[PDB]
Amino acid sequence: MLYPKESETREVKDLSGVWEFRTESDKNYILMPVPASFNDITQDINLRDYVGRVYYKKSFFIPVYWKERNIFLRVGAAAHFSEVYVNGNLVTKHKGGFLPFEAEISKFVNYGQENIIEIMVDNTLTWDVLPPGELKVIEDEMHPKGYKVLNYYFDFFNYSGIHRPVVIYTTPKVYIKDFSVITELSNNSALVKYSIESEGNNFQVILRDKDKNIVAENFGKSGVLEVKNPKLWEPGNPYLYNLEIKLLEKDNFDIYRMDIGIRTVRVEGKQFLINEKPFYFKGFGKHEDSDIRGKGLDQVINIKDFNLLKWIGANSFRTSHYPYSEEILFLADQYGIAVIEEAPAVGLNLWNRNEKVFTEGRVDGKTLEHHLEIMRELIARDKNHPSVIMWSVANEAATYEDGAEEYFRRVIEETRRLDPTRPITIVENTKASETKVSKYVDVICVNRYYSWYTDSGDLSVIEYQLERDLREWYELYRKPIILSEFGADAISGFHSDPPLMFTEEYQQEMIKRFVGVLDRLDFVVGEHIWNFADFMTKQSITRVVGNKKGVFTRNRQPKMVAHFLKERWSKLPDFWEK
Amino acid sequence: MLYPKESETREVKDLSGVWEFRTESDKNYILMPVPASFNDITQDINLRDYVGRVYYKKSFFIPVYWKERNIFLRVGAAAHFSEVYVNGNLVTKHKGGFLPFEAEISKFVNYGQENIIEIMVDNTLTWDVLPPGELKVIEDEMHPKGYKVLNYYFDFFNYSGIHRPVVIYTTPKVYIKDFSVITELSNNSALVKYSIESEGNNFQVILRDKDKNIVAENFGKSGVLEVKNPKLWEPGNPYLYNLEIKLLEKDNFDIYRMDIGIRTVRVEGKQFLINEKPFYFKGFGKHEDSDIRGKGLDQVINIKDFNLLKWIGANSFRTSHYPYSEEILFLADQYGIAVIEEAPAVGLNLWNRNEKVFTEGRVDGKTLEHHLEIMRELIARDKNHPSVIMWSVANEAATYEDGAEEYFRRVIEETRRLDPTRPITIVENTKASETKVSKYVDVICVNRYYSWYTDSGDLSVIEYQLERDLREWYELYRKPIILSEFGADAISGFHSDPPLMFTEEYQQEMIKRFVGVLDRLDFVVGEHIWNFADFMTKQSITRVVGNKKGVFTRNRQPKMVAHFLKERWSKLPDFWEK
Ligand SMILES: [Cl-]
Ligand SMILES: [Cl-]
């Protein structure tokens, strides 16, 4: 499914705005913005911590002239289970809170009249949705009848609601359903190879440069476009060409356009190559999180975040720990930021080797089935973005378990089959010698928190422990390694010398000592600090109103270590043969 | 008067601790620690803001064996007017809140019995005490009968109380009253020249090195001690010799010891020479200020402050804006920190050229008389500390006024007469071409706040304005220049990019741009940032609970710019021929 875009042949109507909202088995509505998480909008603590079904409702008018058009209703994201009703008719259901879903609804609309859309969203986690969790009953001596808790083991808050825009769009009855683009370098040219999915068959395809000059054209539902003297897309030079696809049939006419970038990505030895040059990742793990709206899409915050990425000198980030909005990937295309996009397989770990995760009752064949469908949906959505340069299949799963090996072999095999054009990783906090899964990926991503979660407060252990660990990863697997997470919680304004945990000084010193180690290791091709910004988590005595490891505050202002990273990364080239 | 020190011939009894305390015309006492300001000790807002007389009271016992000894009662400091009573007898009065005073009290004590000391302290400012102020009656339409305000124009809070220790000490009836030491370099030796003040006349004087080896000796009330192969005192090498003075008479025997340092100080051209090498000041304006105790002496805070000075790489500070406790100068001697010690002539300015300061009714002959007595008391107290390397006669007086010229000519002339061994400065915020006073000093000290108090928020003006200004100071006066103050208020934890006033970023960027200018000017011999730490001021819409220009918080932890200064100053030598 293609991102909804207006053209000569397609209308788009955005239903974002103020909706009516209620919780299960309640008749009274309140007002609720869309897109947004509902948790922080009100002062009702029982809604903040609500677990169950909520219902959104809105009126909309369909123009009579949309008859004899396809009418699609698209929901960008709703966490985690959703059902969509048009005038009381169920038009689609969806499982998974971080990818879009849509249905054709012309059969159910009142033309030239009022219509009602209702969207049910259920935030109840189970062990066969990603990320997983479990609702548990607690009726003991200290809890009243009916006390229940939603348990989950990922470290970000279970925000719920409609997190990305709801839109209605039209197409002709015979229309461009999808297309695939692959770019190759050939002699002094680039090739853009394409295939179009449609019931139609007569297509003209045109490629235009930045100045609207036509640089290539082809008649054909599949084909190759040759670009002589191409300008390649890469961090530091985000050149985009505009691909125009025109269906020209007897009764149907359809146009779809997308900006694409010409680049190659390849792993060879201990090098991560973009356009055949050795890349060095400088960046962050991020989160879709901001004040008040929770996980809701906000283009103000998105553009602010990319300007901060360019300001600090980052060239990349990982979409920890789930696919982000398409909007963020289009921006990464424009700004020239390399993206590792990650499936929502986070929380597959009970920090305890006595509780097994990959076992009947928890992560099983049903979870695997969902994970495989997720990879198919994710690659289908994002396969044409130049900014996505790697897929991450999971974050900190219990990869030391025997059952994790067969599980992830299947996930990894399916991902590569779906997209052979990008490398694959998995983000590990398991010990190097214990993971049964990292031997199957292209690039190793390791999260390490020496002197924070272990030997807390003792910065002196970092060089000893980190160098020994990373050398063992390389000795066992002989793959490029990204230090995919490291950092320390810092309360803005907490200062100390000597540095103490939770101060800005400790965060900067820890990060500084980690990267001094990486500079001595020629097989380390990247550093991603956790996290870009402070974000909300569930409440616990270990979380000082959320996770405070941001390099920026939640309102997008820098802590001390942001300036250290700006100075370091201004000296580090994007392409660096270590 | 010499600092009270125990020896074979002298006892010291410290009366610090818990005293009884009351305000004027009130019979009920509360408890009050000494030394401390009384303002922040209680939760009584009317005592915090009290103006008038307060009374301290304490019992003490004199041993019968102190008969036929001199018994001295010393008050380290009490702001600003004080009277001392022993068993109801007035033994001394004192004017000025930052220098010690004492009296011989054997005539008034009950030997082997209880005694009562009472100390009255008055914090009411006038135009003939330093620093000056004025109590004003405000009985208009919006103020009730009896509303009064203490107006003053210096930017630190008018803390009051007994700020330094009260002690009683004994001496023999014929005793060492004072001594003067001057050090010179001669061939490969150093000379320590001395004169002793006493009714006695037979003296043996011995000088010992760090390991208690005797390196020089002399019999004589005046004389010269030769030190072959001297180890000189300087920042980065604080070598101290111990001077022992022994009075040996028929009926009287007295010993006094003091650590001294061998160093010379001299201004020549645009150079400030210590031990004939070109010094570069790296440091701060400080304040005697800390949480809860106000201006009270606290040796924990003092030692913490010197360890921070060494940690950040500072080699100097100015005692803005008054003499500090003797304790701090003994520590500066031990740590090797160069001190510019300043008289309390601050607040001689009504930021307004229509209100004249040096005029009948304000700063006049009575103020001058007090200022001259202050310089005599200050040099008499501190003349033998190696750490004091310069006297500052005032801070930000209205030196553009005609009347300021005659006033300060007399102050400067008297200071040089009292101590020809150290250079003299005055700290200016007047425009270079307008001051009528800086032409009379040895070193120029200028306070500049471009982009803070003027063109607020615009960091881009700094290089243009500061370089032009400092070149004009040098062109007019041809003297070495210290940038004696510059900085910005920063709330700990306030961050922004781009930098905004009151953020840690703005403070660091402003300071960074100022010192980049100084590095290009070979006549600038010093940089002192305002301030070492956040300190309290009177309340106003311009003061966010005090002055927030500290590089350290009030609890002595670093802000962002502290780390910038540590890195800069670790690269700058103490002795630097620019
Ligand atoms: Cl974390
Ligand atoms: Cl100031």
Coordinates of N, CA and C in Angstrom, one line a residue, chain A residues 304 308 311 492-498 504-505 508 553 556-560 563 567, chain B residues 304 308 311 492-498 504-505 508 553 556-560 563 567:
Chain A
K304 N 11.8 19.6 13.8 CA 12.7 20.0 14.8 C 13.8 18.9 15.1
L308 N 17.8 19.2 14.6 CA 18.8 18.9 15.6 C 19.8 17.8 15.2
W311 N 22.2 19.6 13.2 CA 23.0 20.5 14.0 C 24.1 19.7 14.8
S492 N 18.3 17.0 33.8 CA 18.7 18.3 33.4 C 18.9 19.2 34.6
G493 N 20.1 19.8 34.8 CA 20.4 20.6 35.9 C 21.0 19.8 37.1
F494 N 21.0 18.5 37.1 CA 21.8 17.8 38.1 C 23.3 17.8 37.7
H495 N 24.2 18.4 38.5 CA 25.6 18.5 38.2 C 26.4 18.0 39.3
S496 N 27.5 17.3 39.1 CA 28.4 17.1 40.2 C 29.9 16.9 39.7
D497 N 30.8 17.2 40.5 CA 32.2 16.7 40.4 C 32.7 16.3 41.7
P498 N 33.3 15.1 41.8 CA 33.4 14.1 40.8 C 32.0 13.7 40.2
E504 N 24.5 15.3 34.6 CA 25.0 15.6 33.2 C 26.4 15.2 33.0
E505 N 27.3 15.4 34.0 CA 28.7 15.1 33.9 C 28.9 13.6 33.7
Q508 N 28.1 12.5 30.2 CA 29.1 12.9 29.2 C 30.4 12.1 29.4
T553 N 16.6 17.0 26.1 CA 15.4 16.9 26.9 C 14.2 16.5 26.1
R556 N 13.3 18.9 23.5 CA 14.2 19.0 22.4 C 15.3 20.1 22.6
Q557 N 15.8 20.2 23.8 CA 16.9 21.1 24.1 C 18.1 20.3 24.6
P558 N 19.3 20.8 24.4 CA 20.5 19.9 24.6 C 20.9 19.8 26.0
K559 N 21.4 18.6 26.4 CA 22.1 18.5 27.7 C 23.6 18.7 27.4
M560 N 24.4 18.6 28.4 CA 25.9 18.9 28.3 C 26.5 17.9 27.2
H563 N 26.7 18.7 23.4 CA 27.7 19.6 22.9 C 29.0 18.8 22.7
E567 N 30.9 18.3 18.9 CA 32.3 18.6 18.7 C 33.0 17.4 18.1
Chain B
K304 N 36.8 23.2 50.3 CA 36.1 22.8 49.1 C 36.4 23.8 48.0
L308 N 38.3 23.1 44.4 CA 37.7 23.4 43.1 C 38.6 24.3 42.3
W311 N 41.2 22.2 40.9 CA 40.6 21.3 39.9 C 40.3 21.9 38.5
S492 N 20.9 26.5 36.7 CA 21.3 25.2 36.5 C 20.2 24.3 35.9
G493 N 20.4 23.6 34.8 CA 19.3 22.9 34.1 C 18.6 23.6 33.1
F494 N 18.7 25.0 33.0 CA 18.2 25.7 31.8 C 19.1 25.5 30.6
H495 N 18.6 24.9 29.6 CA 19.4 24.6 28.4 C 18.6 25.1 27.2
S496 N 19.4 25.6 26.2 CA 18.7 25.9 24.9 C 19.7 25.9 23.7
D497 N 19.3 25.5 22.6 CA 19.9 25.8 21.3 C 18.9 26.3 20.3
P498 N 19.1 27.5 19.6 CA 20.3 28.4 19.9 C 20.3 28.9 21.3
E504 N 22.6 27.6 30.4 CA 24.0 27.2 30.6 C 24.8 27.4 29.3
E505 N 24.1 27.2 28.1 CA 24.8 27.4 26.8 C 25.2 28.8 26.6
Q508 N 28.3 29.8 28.6 CA 29.5 29.2 28.1 C 29.9 29.9 26.8
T553 N 27.4 26.1 41.1 CA 26.2 26.4 41.9 C 26.6 26.8 43.3
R556 N 28.4 24.4 45.2 CA 29.8 24.1 44.8 C 29.8 22.9 43.8
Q557 N 28.9 22.9 42.9 CA 29.0 21.9 41.8 C 29.0 22.6 40.5
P558 N 29.6 22.0 39.4 CA 30.0 22.8 38.2 C 28.8 22.9 37.3
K559 N 28.7 24.1 36.6 CA 27.8 24.3 35.5 C 28.6 23.9 34.2
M560 N 28.0 23.9 33.1 CA 28.6 23.5 31.8 C 29.9 24.3 31.6
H563 N 33.4 23.2 32.9 CA 34.2 22.3 32.1 C 34.9 22.9 31.0
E567 N 39.1 23.0 30.6 CA 39.9 22.5 29.4 C 40.8 23.7 28.9

